[PDB]
Design a protein around this ligand. Structure first.
Ligand code: ERP
Ligand code: ERP
Ligand code: NA
Ligand code: NA
Lengths: 314, 313
């Protein structure tokens, strides 16, 4: 049972058919505008549900969440513990993506700010202790309180600060990392974390059980404290539609695989599959799950043996 | 009777409490409001509020109901808004920083259907308007509107504004000839001269008046013979949001001209409406207070000019 904390949002996604090239008053004429369900916690919960996992969504939304709830619940997500603001609206992510998958975005937190009032003790009380708590991009204070609560209650947690790393300070990031069963970042975020925390690579590795560093088209690295390193290349894409939510999908597929008892490499291969499915669609939860297509692409990228091992648990 | 053609939209306006000075830009914003917008909507709203007879001529989606009720409640004739069967109203998405710098993206949507609007139908229904504003719109719609104005003998104001970036030289040239007014800002004026290959005198020989807004330095009104009037801004008490300030200036100026005011008095009224828009979030969220208008006009331009302006409202 995975508890997913983080932002719940509506993503307003636009497509610019050009290349961001301005060199202030930028204006981009866009040829596509879609509104989809989003937020890192929503994306990851959706993906874990679709893949058949036991998952609860733990975040702060406004009252408009009804339809979103019905969507998530239809894929097995426990939405009981979504905090609903009576006054604030759900967070909104507004993003314009160009031909090269470069993004210009703005994020309005709104109801997300109230996530600091959520107590994991209540979720535990209601559902028992989850096997993993994902501390995703959220209200910063909510992130700290969730992490501290996980440490006090003995809950294994995955640090997934993601977009909020830019906002947070060194002391803040440091307070987020110690004791994590997983640390998730991309490579640029990994460099930024090392810089801001003042930690060396070995400083971080001595405080976590596993580092997962996504590398975009170069795949993903999984590094154990002793230096054991697994590199998993991407599932090659047939199109680059929109990069929004690709990292969330990788994390969700990877942690679903781990929850199904798969090894590190097999879990990362499954995560790579879900990631490419998200890369090839517009929106973070618009991707479809086709069992046979999944088997086929997994086998093409990683071999029939790995594909069979992966699909056997889904 | 002023006919306003141009974009009808919903403006999604955000505020970045920082300074745009940071590819993967990400801005954490502390305000998000959704307001009624589009250049034609803004100008029609302003002309209605100020008591003018105005018709809105643009393309919207089906959600336009509430917007229509609003505009009509301020006296705007919305009969000739074309309503798309499938497309939603255009959306303008903008993030503004402390210095009023903007990073925006514009989705035309239903606006593209404005090319199917015939000004002849509007004329038929309401008679010949005293002025047609060719605001930022579907480019082909802009050309067809301008040509129709020339064909029917309708005086028109060239107001390409945001679309100048999209359009080409020949296109811009096609928009200008015969205009009773040419509206741009100073940067847009330079860009127009560059892209069209025209000199200043080339343009002035084809229009009756050039109006070039200069942001904080006010506005210039240049006649073909070189007669030039400069009108400073109405000084602001706050820089809230720059969206729609130019539309408000144009609307106040052309309302003044329709009320028989001179060029300078009309530009002073336009400066007032412009500052009212600058001091609020959204393009049509500003209120009209007669006494506050008189007082600020008198403070900026003298009691005489203020009395002359308010006498017609
Ligand atoms: O994974 C994609 C999902 O993320 C969801 N989302 C997209 N942004 C976010 C954020 C965030 C942020 C941020 C913080 C600070 C600055 C900043 C400001 C000023 C100066 C420097 C930095 C900028 C941006 N937080 C939570 N979820 C997000 C989206 O809803 C989408 O579905
Ligand atoms: O006056 C404010 C009102 O304008 C309304 N609006 C805000 N934009 C627009 C536009 C436009 C544009 C444009 C064209 C071309 C490029 C471009 C692309 C690629 C490369 C170079 C340039 C970008 C942007 N058109 C009509 N109304 C607008 C808003 O609804 C608001 O209320
Ligand atoms: Na996507
Ligand atoms: Na404004």
């Amino acid at each position: 049972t995975i508890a997913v904390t983080g932002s719940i949002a509506t993503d307003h996604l636009m497509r610019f058919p050009g290349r961001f090239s301005e060199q202030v008053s930028l204006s981009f004429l866009v040829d596509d505008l879609v509104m989809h369900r989003g937020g890192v916690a929503g994306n990851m919960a959706f993906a874990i549900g679709v893949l058949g996992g036991e998952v609860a969504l733990v975040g702060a939304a406004g009252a408009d969440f009804a339809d979103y709830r019905d969507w998530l619940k239809a894929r097995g997500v426990n939405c009981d513990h979504v905090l609903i603001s009576e006054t604030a609206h759900t967070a909104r992510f507004t993003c314009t993506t160009d031909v090269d998958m470069a993004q210009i975005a703005s994020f309005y937190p709104g109801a997300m700010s109230e996530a600091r009032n959520i107590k994991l003790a209540d979720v535990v009380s209601a559902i028992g202790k989850p096997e993993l708590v994902i501390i995703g991009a959220n209200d910063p204070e909510a992130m700290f309180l969730h992490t501290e609560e996980c440490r006090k209650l003995g809950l294994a947690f995955a640090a997934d600060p993601s977009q909020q790393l830019a906002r947070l300070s060194g002391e803040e990031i440091r307070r987020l990392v110690n004791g994590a069963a997983y640390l998730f970042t991309n490579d640029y975020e990994w460099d930024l974390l090392l810089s801001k925390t003042g930690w060396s690579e070995a400083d971080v590795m001595a405080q976590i059980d596993l580092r997962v560093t996504t590398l975009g088209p170069k795949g993903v690295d999984l590094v154990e404290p002793d230096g054991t390193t697994i590199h998993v290349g991407v599932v090659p894409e047939t199109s680059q539609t929109d990069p929004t939510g690709v990292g969330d999908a990788f994390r969700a597929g990877f942690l679903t695989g781990r929850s199904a008892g798969l090894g590190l490499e097999r879990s990362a291969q499954l995560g790579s599959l879900v990631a490419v499915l998200v890369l090839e669609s517009t929106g973070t939860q618009e991707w479809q799950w086709d069992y046979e297509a999944a088997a086929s692409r997994l086998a093409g990228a990683y071999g029939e043996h790995a594909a069979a091992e992966i699909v056997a648990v889904l």
